[PDB]
Amino acid sequence: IKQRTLKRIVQATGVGLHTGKKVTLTLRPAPANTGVIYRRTDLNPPVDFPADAKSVRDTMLCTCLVNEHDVRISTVEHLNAALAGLGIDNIVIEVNAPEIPIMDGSAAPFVYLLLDAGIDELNCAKKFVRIKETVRVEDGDKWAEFKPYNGFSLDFTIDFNHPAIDSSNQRYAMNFSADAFMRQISRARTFGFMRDIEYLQSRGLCLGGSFDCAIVVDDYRVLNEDGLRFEDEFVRHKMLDAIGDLFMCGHNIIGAFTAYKSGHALNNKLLQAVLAKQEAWEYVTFQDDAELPLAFKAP
Numbered sequence: 635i636k637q638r639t640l641k642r643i644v645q646a647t648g649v650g651l652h653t654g655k656k657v658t659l660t661l662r663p664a665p666a667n668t669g670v671i672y673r674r675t676d677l678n679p680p681v682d683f684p685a686d687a688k689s690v691r692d693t694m695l696c697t698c699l700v701n702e703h704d705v706r707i708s709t710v711e712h713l714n715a716a717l718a719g720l721g722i723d724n725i726v727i728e729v730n731a732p733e734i735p736i737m738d739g740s741a742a743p744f745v746y747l748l749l750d751a752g753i754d755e756l757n758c759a760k761k762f763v764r765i766k767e768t769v770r771v772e773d774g775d776k777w778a779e780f781k782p783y784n785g786f787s788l789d790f791t792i793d794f795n796h797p798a799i800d801s802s803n804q805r806y807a808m809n810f811s812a813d814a815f816m817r818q819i820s821r822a823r824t825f826g827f828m829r830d831i832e833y834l835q836s837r838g839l840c841l842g843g844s845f846d847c848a849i850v851v852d853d854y855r856v857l858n859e860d861g862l863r864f865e866d867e868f869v870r871h872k873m874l875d876a877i878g879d880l881f882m883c884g885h886n887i888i889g890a891f892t893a894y895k896s897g898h899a900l901n902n903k904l905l906q907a908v909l910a911k912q913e914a915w916e917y918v919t920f921q922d923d924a925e926l927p928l929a930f931k932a933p
């Protein structure tokens with residue numbers, strides 16, 4: 635019902651999945667109506683990237699923020715999913731490199747870092763995007779849609795034809811809440827095929843890839859010694875990505891998200907399509923937290 639930021643400043647270091655470059659990440663309290671601001675500090679003067687759906691590029695196997703001249707910060711979807719998780723509206727994210735550190739491949743280390751910084755509630759009203767019409771976008775056999783619904787629901791179906799990713803759980807559905815996100819989604823790691831690593835590293839992608847930040851799968855199985863944190867970790871990670879992608883507008887959404895084989899590109903195309911239709915959505919604030927959907931009760 636009230637907007638949110640951090641109580642104090644926290645730092646973590648790590649490496650960029652794509653660049654291999656060492657990075658330090660600084661999260662910063664920000665006053666009301668600031669929004670979500672990414673900032674590169676390896677550049678002087680430092681360059682600000684406000685989170686906006688029109689500022690997304692989809693080309694580098696992840697979600698990148700870019701300005702009008704294609705200067706960029708890569709691999710924002712995992713930290714962004716953590717901000718969506720804990721309802722954070724106003725924050726400054728500083729990196730001294732062109733990319734967010736990958737940490738353990740999931741959103742959980744971002745969740746711990748934000749909880750250690752404590753959440754500060756503000757005396758100004760948190761704005762929600764309420765979906766007021768069905769919108770649908772497509773790409774081959776891939777599709778993604780939003781529908782009006784008095785909460786926040788995600789229904790995600792993947793189709794990977796691969797023995798190590800059993801069909802039995804290539805679909806996942808949840809009603810969103812900070813606690814659910816934290817218990818069911820936040821610890822789901824990124825993954826990659828051993829068959830792809832030569833190609834991707836020859837192009838300057840996944841240079842920071844390790845068994846520490848990813849599930850590695852060969853032609854038959856998961857190679858990681860300790861296996862999976864969940865039998866369906868693959869589709870939970872795809873849903874983590876989708877939550878990060880939908881928060882590029884900088885507001886939690888009131889709606890029912892459904893997707894088949896969607897990714898960064900189609901998830902942004904959906905988010906954009908919605909915001910381009912004046913009549914498909916509406917801001918809404920909450921005077922009393924009685925009318926506020928259970929999806930957004932504080933953690």
Ligand SMILES: CC(C)C(=O)N1C[C@H](NC(=O)[C@@H]2C[C@H](F)CN2)C[C@@H]1C(=O)NCc1ccc(C#Cc2ccccc2)cc1
Nearest residue numbers: 695696711824825826827831840843844845848850871875
């Ligand atoms: C199959 C593949 C085309 C795909 O469809 N998706 C969808 C998922 N994407 C995400 O999780 C996104 C992109 C970013 F990972 C953060 N969010 C996951 C996988 C993907 O691109 N993985 C990226 C990726 C690829 C490879 C290694 C290695 C590695 C490695 C490990 C050990 C030693 C050397 C190298 C990591 C990662």
Ligand SMILES: [Zn+2]
Nearest residue numbers: 711824871875
């Ligand atoms: Zn991911």
